[model samples]
Target: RSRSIWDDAHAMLEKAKAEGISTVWDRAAEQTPACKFCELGTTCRNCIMGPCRIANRKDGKMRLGVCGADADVIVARNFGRFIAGGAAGHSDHGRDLIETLEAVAEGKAPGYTIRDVAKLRRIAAELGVADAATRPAHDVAADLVTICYNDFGSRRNALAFLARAPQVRRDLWQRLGMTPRGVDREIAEMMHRTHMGCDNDHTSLLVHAARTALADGWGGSMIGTELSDILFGTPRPRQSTVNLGVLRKDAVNILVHGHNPVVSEMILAATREPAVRQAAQDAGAADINVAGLCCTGNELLMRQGIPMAGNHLMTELAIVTGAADAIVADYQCIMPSLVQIAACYHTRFVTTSPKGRFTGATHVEVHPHNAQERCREIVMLAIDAYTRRDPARVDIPSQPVSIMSGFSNEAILEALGGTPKPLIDAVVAGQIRGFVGIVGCNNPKIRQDSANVTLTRELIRRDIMVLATGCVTTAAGKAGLLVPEAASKAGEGLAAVCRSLGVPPVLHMGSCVDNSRILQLCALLATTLGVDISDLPVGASSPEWYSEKAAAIAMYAVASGIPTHLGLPPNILGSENVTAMALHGLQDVVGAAFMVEPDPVKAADMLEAHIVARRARLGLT
Candidate 1:
C-alpha cells in the first residue's frame, strides 16, 4: 500500500488530521534512526553488564563491554550464539532423521517404507556399517542411523559427515580446532562460554560457535537432508503454490510449522488417506487443506507440492485470521504465543515433538516408530477442530499469492539441460548469467518481507537466475516471483532462458536445511562441470536474514570456496583479527570469503562484480 512505514505513517497522519484527532503519528512518521556513534562494525560496552555496541567512529580506538569484553569478543560471542541456534535447529532435525531411519530399518514404522535403497546403502557405507550385502537393508539402515544419532552427542571425532567437506575446508576447520565432535555438544559449549560469567573472550566464543554451525551445515544438517532425500526420494522440480489463498475455507486447514520433516512427512501421508478426507468432509469440511509454515512449509512445498501458508512472522496472522483449523508444529521457529493466540479462536495448536512442547499446545509426541499412527491421530484432531469453527466469527484474509515452488539442485540441473554440462555450457555461451541463492529468514526489525522480496527481484532483473530456500523462498512465492509469469521482470537474458526452459527465473530449493542443495549444486558445478564453484559466476545472499542458521550458511559457503555476502550487520566488527581471518584468511585457505554490504544496490553490485571476476578467472567470459 505504501513504499515504506514513513509513507504509511504520513497517510495515517493525514487521515487523523481530517478526523480531528489531536494525537498525530509522529513516531511512525519520523525517519527511523540508523546505528550511529559506534563504528557500524565495532562493538561497545555502554551497558552495566553487557552494553557492547560496535565502535561507530573511525578513530581506530578499542571499545569494550562492561565486562571488559572487546568489540571482537562481543561480536564473536553474539555471532557464536547465532551459530548455536542454527546448529541446534539443524542437528535436532538430524536426530529426528536418525530416529526415522532406525524405525524404518527395524520395520517398526508403518505407512512409510524405504524408497531409495541405493542411497541408503551409500549412506550406510559412509557411516562404516559393514556387511551390507549380507545384512538386511533394515539392519544397515538401523546401524547407520545409530551411528549418525551418536554424532549428535559424541565427544570425540565422531561426526561421520565431516569428511564430506572439501579437503581444504576440512583442513581449515581442523587447523582452527573448530571441528565439532558432536552436534549438541558444540552448541552447548557455545552457550556455556557466552553465558554471563562464562567464557569472556569473544574470539574464543565465536570460534566455538563457528564450529557448532559448521557441524550443522556440513555434519548434522547435511546428513539429515541427504538421508531424508534417500528415504523420501530427492526432490525434483514440481509445481506448487503459496500464500493464504492456498488455504481452503470449506476444507479442514492443517498448517504444519517448525523445521523437522519427519512429523510433517507422516502428516502428509495421513492427509492422503480416504478416511482422513472423508472425516474432514464429515466434520463440515469439503476437503483436507494442508499448508506449511517456516522450514516445515519449505520441506513439504519443495518435495510434495503442498502450498505454504506463510513465513515466520505470519504464524500469528494465520491463527488470527481464524482460518487455520489446526496448526501442527515440530520444532524451531515455533512461537509460544501460538498457544495464547489460539485460545481466542477455534484453532488447535498441536505440538508433535518432545523437544518443542508448549504449555498451551496439545501435546502429541510423534515417536519415529509410530509416526503414521500419530499422524492419523493428529489429523482427527484437526478435523475435530474444524468442527468447532464458527463461520460467523471467521476473519479469513482474501489475499493469497501465486507461487511456483519445488526446485531442487537436481531439478535445476535437469531443467537447465538434463545434464550438468549443458547448464555449464549455457553459462559459458552467455545465454545465462549465473545463480544467486536467496536464502534465510524474514525479520520483523526490517519491513516485513521487504528485504527478501526487493533483493530477489533486483537480482532476477539483472539476469541472475535465483535459487531460494527457507522463509526467503516463501517471501518470493508470496511476491509472485516463483511463478514463470514473474520472469517478465527478469533481465532479457534470464527471461529468455526461463521462457525456453518454461521455469521461473527464481527457483525454490526447499527449506533452510535444504541450503545443502545449493552447496551440492556448487560442488557439481565445480567437479562435474569442470569449473570450481569459486570460478563460477554465482553468488549467495540473505537480504532479510536474522538467524544464526544464516550466519552458519554464509560461513560454510565461504569455506567451500565461494564468496558469500550478507545484507545484514556483521556480528564480528569488534575483532579486526577475526574479521580478517573470515575475509582475507579464508580466501587463502578456501579461495573465497565473506563480504558485508548493507545497501541493497551496493550489495547487488558486489555480487555482480564477484560473479564477473570469477567468470573471468575461469575463462568463461
Candidate 2:
C-alpha cells in the first residue's frame, strides 16, 4: 500500500518501482532499526573525555559517563543543542532578511523594493524609530534593521516583540527566567551549558532551551514574517494548485526548493520575462513553468499563486517525474542527496544560496544587487536542461488540486471586516470552539500525510479551526479540505462561520517561517481577551513532524503556553525524568505540555479537551 494520500503520488511511486529508481521511502527502509542509544537521546559526545552513551542499567557501569553526568544531564544537553540548532536556522534566516533590508536602505540591494510601504512604516513606528511614518522609507528601513539586529545582540532585557504578548505572559516569562533577551545570546549559552559541566540540572537546561525557542518564535521568526510582508507584499487571499502534476511535460519546469523567498521571488520574476520564456521556446519547450517545493513553494504559493510540485518528502520524487528541468534551492531542509538524485535525470541541480551547497550542483550565489540577473541565468539554465529531457523517463503524476492560500493575519482581519470582532464573537457564542494550527513536515516513519490529514479532519469536525502550513498544507489540499466549500465537512457551528466569512475550514497560512504569524495572532487574541496565550482556546499540532525546525516550533508553542501535540515522541524518551517533564511536568509550569498520540481520533479528543477547558476558563459556551 502507498503511504501518500494523493493519486498522483501513488502513480509516481508505481513509476519509481517500475524504473528501479529509489525514493526516500526506499532509503528509509534501509535505515530502520536505527541505533537505540542515539534514538533514545542517551548518546553524548560533547566532550573528548566521554563520547559517552547512557544506559538504563542497575549495574551503574555506564550510568554516569566519564563526566559524572547522568542520563538527565546528557539528554537535556543534547536536546538543548538540538533546539539551539533549530533556533539558529530561523534566526539566521531572519538575519539574512535584515541584511537584505540593510542593502536596500543603503542602495546596494537591487531587484528589491519596499513593496508594502505602509507595512514598513507601521512596523517602523511600532519599533519606536523616530518619526517613522513621516520619515523616508530608506531612513525608516535603516532604523528597523537596527532594531532587529539589536534583538540578536546582548543589549536587550527582552525582545522588542515580546512586548506584544499579554503582560501576564511577559511577567511570567520574566519570573521563570524564560525571557528571551537576545536570539544569539540564548543559543550561545545553551551550547555553553551543555559543555562538560556547565548546567548539570536537566530542568535548568530545559528552561534555557525554551528561552532559545522563544527567541526564534518571537524574535527571529517574527521579524522574518513581518519584514517579508513588508518586502514582498503581504499575502492576501490567492488561488493556487498543488501536486507533481503541476509540472509540465511540454514546458521547462523550474522547481524552487528550500525556505527563502529572497531567491524564489526573483526566480519567479525572471520567469515572466519575455526573454526568459523566449529562450525556453527556442530550447523547444512550449513554456517556462515554476513550481514550489517545501516552504519555498509555500512562500510563492502564499503570495504569487505559484503552483506547488510537492512538499518535503517529494523533492526527489519531483525529479523522478523527469519534468523538473532545474531545481533551484536556497537553504533549510534541502537534502544534499538531491544533487545525486538530479544527476540520475536531466534536471539541473542549482544551489542559490552560499549556504546551501552541493558538491556536484551548479552554484548560483544570489545577492540583492545581482538577483535580477542571477535569476535570469537560473531560468536560462532550466531552459537548457529542458533540451536534455529524456522522454521515456518523464511521467507526470496526478492532476493538480485546487487550494486557496495567502491567509496572512491582515487577510484574516480584512475578511472579518477590519476587526477580529466577528471571529471573537463566534468563539464566545460557541459557534467556533477554538483554533489549532496543524503545522510541520512529514516523516517516512509515519504513513506520509495519513496522520496529518486524519488529525486535521477530526479537529475541524469538532469545530476547531485548522490553520495549516508546511507539509500539512499539501496534505490538506490533496484531501480537498482547504477550500471554502470544505466548510461542509467541518462541525455545524464552524461551518456556519466559514460560510459567513467565505473562508475555508482549514486556512493555508504560509510556509514554516510563517508559523510566526500564528504566534502573532495568539498574542493579538490574548491581548484582546485580556489574558495570556495559555488562556486562549488554541493548540499546535505536528502530527507527522520530521525536522529540528518542527521540534523548535513545538517547543516555542508549548513554552508560549500553547499545548502542542506530536504523533511520535522526541528523543528525550531515554530519560524518564526528562520525558515526564516534557509530557506532564511542563503542563504545571507553563499551562501547556506535549501530547504524543499516534491515533488521530485520540489526538483530536485530547486537543478538544484542552480547548474546552480553556473555553470554560473564559466562561464561553
Candidate 3:
C-alpha cells in the first residue's frame, strides 16, 4: 500500500514508476520491517563503548548498554536529542529572520523594508521597548531586534513571550521548573544533558525535553512569526490555489521549497520583475510563475496569495510533472531526494541557503545583504531551463484547488472587530464547540494526506473548528475545507459561526513556526476567560507527521497544557516506563499528554474526547 489518497500524487507515482524513478514510497518499501531495536529506541551509539542494544530475556540478560545505561536511560536520552534537533531547526529559522530584520533596520538589505510598521511598534511595546509608538520604525525595530536576540541568550528567568501565557499557567510552569529561560540555552543544555552520563534519569530528561521545545514554541518560533509579520506584512484573509495543478505548463514554473521566507520572498519579487517576465517570454514561455512547496509555500501563500504546488510528500511528484523549470530552496524540510529526482527532468534544483546545499545541484547562496540580486540570478536560471523543456514529458496533473489562505492572529482578532470578545462570545454560547490545530507533514509510511484530511473532516463535522498549519494546510485546502463556502461541511454550530464571519471552519493559520500563532490565540482566550489554557476546549494533532520538528511541536503543545494527538507513536516503545510517562504521566504533571492512534477516525475520537472533557470542565456543557 505505498500509494496516496491524492490523485495528482498517484498519477505522478505511476509516471515515476513507468520511467523507473524511485520515490519516497519506493524507498520506504525498500526498508520494510526495519530493525526492531532501533525502531523501539533501545539502541545506543552515543559513547560507542559497545554500540549496544538492550533486550529482555527470562534471565534478564543484556538489560543495559555498555555504560550500564538501562533502556529507560537510552530511550529518554534519544528522545531528548530528538526534541533538541527539532527545536534547533525552528530556532535557526527564527535567527535568520532576526538577521534579515536587523539588515532592513540598518538599511543594509536592499528591496526589504518594514512592511508593517504599525505591527512593529505594537510588538515593540508589547516586548517592553519604551516609547515604541513614538519612535521611528527603524529605531523601534532595532530595539525590538535586541529584545528578540536577548531571548536567545542566557540572561533571562523566562522568555519574554512567556508573558503571553496566563498568570495561572505561568505560575504552574514556574513551579515545575519548565519555564524556558532562553532558546539557545535550553537547546544547548539538552545537548549537554544527553551527553554520555550527564542526565541519566528518564523523567529528568523528559522535563528538559519540554523546556527545549518550549523555547522553540514561545521564544524562537514566536520571534520568527512576529518578525516575519513585520517584515512581510502580517497576513490577512486571501484566496489562493493549491496542489500539483498549480504548476504552469506554459510558464517558466519555479517552485520555492523549504522554510525561510527571506529567500522565497525575494524569489517571488524577482519572478514579478518586468525584465524577468520578458526573459521568460523570450525563452518561449508565456510568463514566469512562482509556486510554493512545503512550509515555504505556506509562508508565501499566507502573505502573498501565492499558489502552493504541494506539500511534503508531493515534492518529488511535483518535478515528475516535468513542467517544473526550477526549484529554488532555502533551509529545512527539503528532501535531498529532490536533487536526484530533478536530475531526471529539465528541472534545475537551486539551493539558496548555504546550509541547504545539495551536492549535485546549483548553489546560489542567498543572504539578506544580497538576496535581491541573488534571487534575480536564480530566476534567470529558471528561464534558461524553461528554454530546454521537453514538451512530450510534461504533464501538469489536475486543475488547482481554490483555497482561502492567511489567518494570522492579528487577522483573526481584526475580523472580530479588533478584539477577542466576539470569538469568546461565540465559544461561550456554543456557536463554536472547540478548536483543533491540525499541523505537520505527510509521511510515506501512510497514504499521503489520507489521515490529515480525514481527521480534519471528522473534527469539523463534530462542530470543532480546525486550525491548520504546515503541510496540513495543503491537505485541508485540497479537500475543499479552506474556503468560507466549505463551512457547509461543518457541524451546525461551527457552520453558523463560519457563515457569520465569512471564514472557513478550518482556518489556514500559516506555517509550522506560525503554530506559535495558535499558541498566542489560546493564550488570549485563556487570559480573557481568567482560566489556564488547558481549561479551554482545544487540542492539537499531527496525523501524518514524519519529521523531528513535528515531534517538537507536539511536545510543546502537550507541555503547554494542550492535549496533542499523533497518528504514529515515537520510537520509545522499548521503554514502557518512558512511553507511559509520555502518554499518561505527562497528563498529571502538565495537565496534558500525547495521544497516539493509527486510525484518523480513532485519532479524532481521542482528540474530541479531550476537547469535550475540557468543555465540561469549563462548564460550557
Candidate 4:
C-alpha cells in the first residue's frame, strides 16, 4: 500500500516496517479522525476567554465564541496567523541572506564572496545604488544591503523590490491597500491584528493576509533569491539526480535538510576538501556523497547540481535507508523525529541554527563569520560516523534518475534566446497556452506525491506547462517529468515548443521561496501584453500542500490575481463567508480565487478552463 507512485519510497517503507521503525504515514494513521472544530478553523484558543468552538447553525448554540466573534472572524483570524507564521519563516530566512550580504560587503564573511559580479552590478543599478557598474563590488553591495535592510524596517510604504511588479498592478495594490511595506512589520501587524478582540472583519483580515505574503514573495524571498545568486553564482542549466538512491552505499552519505543554502553551500564546499576526501578514504569508503532534502535540496540541486534524496515525507525514510551518516539541518519544515530515528542507527543528527535546535541532536550553530570552520567540523562528524557504518543494515533502493535542474528565470530566458520574447511569442501563437506553478509540500494524509505527480502528468497532457518548486520538484523529477525527453509526454502544442527549446515539460523554477521568480515572470508577461496577471492564462496549484509556507504561497498567488487551486481545503471551510470570500468573493475583487478540488483530473479541468478563458480573452485561437 505504501508502494504507490513512489518507487524508492515504497522500498524504504517496507524496510522501515521490517526494522520496527515508525514513519510519518504510521503516525498519520494513528492521528486519524482529526478534530473537527480545529480542522474547520472554528476553534479559537487565542485568548483565555473560554477556549471556544463555533458551531455554525441558526439556533445560535455555540455559534459565536465568548468574546462575540463569529465564524468568519474566527476563520479569518486563524488564517491570518497561519499566513503570518509562514511569512515569518521565509522572511527570517531572507533576513539571514541580507546579513550574509552585509558581511560579504564588510569583508567579514570568510569563505564567501560575490561570485556573480555581473548580477550584483545589474541588481545594484536597478536599486539605485551609486555608480553600480563602476563602483567597487563591496561598496555597491553595501548600498544594496542598506536598501534591502530598509525594506525590512518600518519606514517604507512599499518594499524596494515592489517596483519589479507592473506599474498598473502597483497602482491597483495601492488602491486596495495591498502594497507590502516592511517584511517584519507586516508579520508583526498580522500577529497584532489576529489577536483576540481585534480585526473582526473577515475581508479586512484577508486583505492583510495578502499584504503579509507579499512581503514574503516580493520583500524577503525576492531579496534572498537575488542576493543568493550574487554570493553563490546565479544558477544556470545544471544536471542533477533525484531520490533516496542518490545516497551512497560505500561513501559517507550526508543529507542536507531544511531551507537555507548558506549552510548547505558551505557543507558542499567542505565535502570537496582534499582533507575530507582523504578522511573518507581512511574510513574505507568512497568520497563523500552529499544529497539534499526539501527546499534546501532544491537550492543545492539548482545551483550545485547535488542529488535530492527526498522531499517532506521522505525525510525519515531517507534515514531508514540506513546509509545517511549525518543529517545536517538548518531551519524550516525539518521533522524532529529524525533525531530519534537517526539515534536508532549509526547516523548522527546535527542542527546548525539556533531556531532549529532539536533536543537530542548535536547543535553546531553556523554564522557567516564561522561557517567556513563550522561546515568543515560538520563534515568530520559525518566522516567519523561513517567508521561505524553498518554495511549489513544498509539498503539503498533503486538508481538515481537524471534531472535537468537550475531553471532560474535567467536560465529560462537564456534558453529562449536571451529574452522573454520567444516565450511570449509562443503563448500568443498558441504554441504554449499557459503555465501552472506546481508547488507546496507532502501531507501524510495524502498518499505521498500521489496528487503531486498525477496533477503534473494531467496538466502537461493538456498542454499546461508546469513550473515546479518545493516538494513537487522531487515528485516531477522522480516521475521522469523533469527531463528534456519528457516533452513527448506533453500535449502536442507544448511538446513542440518544449522539444524546440530543448527543455523539460515541467520546468524546475527552484525552491519554495523562489516562487517569487514565478511572480516576476508573470509580471513580465502581463506587462509585455499590457494586461493584468489575472488577464493572463497562468495559474498556481498546491495539490499536496501541508506547510504554512505552502498556504502563504497559494494566498499570495491568488492575491496577485492568479487563479490558484488546492487539493485539500484549508481550515477556513467551516465558515461559509470566509470560504466564499476565498473561492468566490476574491474572484470578484482580486480577479482570481481559490478552487478546491480533491481529484487531480477534475483540478486539471478546472485549471484548463481558466486558462482557456484567458486565452480567449487574449484573442488567441
Given candidate 2, what's the lDDT at residue 514?
A: 93
Model 2 regions more than 4 Å off: none
lDDT of 3 by residue, 53-114 (tens): 99998898899987899999999999999999999999999989999999999999999999
Error of 1 at 611 (Å): 1.2
Q: How accurate is candidate 2 locally (lDDT)?
A: 0.90
TM-score to native of every candidate shown = 0.85, 0.99, 0.99, 0.99
Which residue pairs collide, candidate 4? none
Q: Each model's C-alpha lDDT?
A: 0.74, 0.90, 0.93, 0.91
For lDDT, the strongest prediction is 3
Cα deviation of 347, candidate 1, in Å: 0.9
Q: Candidate 4: deviation at residue 269, Å?
A: 0.9
Error of 1 at 308 (Å): 0.9
List the lowest-lDDT window of 10 residues for candidate 2.
Answer: 1-10
Which lDDT tens digits does candidate 4 get at residues 1-621? 553478788998899999999887888888888999999999999889879998957886998889999888999999999999999988998899999999999999899989999999999999888799998999999999999999989999899888877887888888988999999999999999988877989999999999999899898889988888998888887888998899989898999999989999999999988988998999888789999999999989999898999899889989988899999999999998898899999998999999898899999999999999999999999999999988888999989899999999989989998888889888888878889999999987778889999999999988889999999999999999999999989999999999998899999988999999999899888887788888999999998899899899998898888999999999998889989889999997778999999898899999999999999998987
lDDT-sorted candidate list, best first: 3, 4, 2, 1
Model 2, range 410-520, lDDT digits (tens) per residue? 999999999899999999999899999999999888878899999999988999999999999999998889889999999999999999988999999998889999999
- Model 4 superposed RMSD (Cα): 1.1
lDDT of 1 by residue, 1-621 (tens): 232222222333343344343221223245346354243445444346645564546885445555666666666666667667777778878777877777788777786677777778877887688976567888878888777877876556836776655554556678877787888888888877876667776456656766776677767787778888867777777777776567777889999999877888889899889988888877778788889899888888877888887777666666755678999998877867678767877888899888997986799988777788999999999999998997775555545667777676657766766787767776887767778888877665566567777778788888888888888876787677888898799988888888888898888888888888787777666666555566678888887777767778877677566778777665565467777776666676657777777676787888888888887887776
> Which residue window of length 10 is worst by lDDT in model 4?
1-10
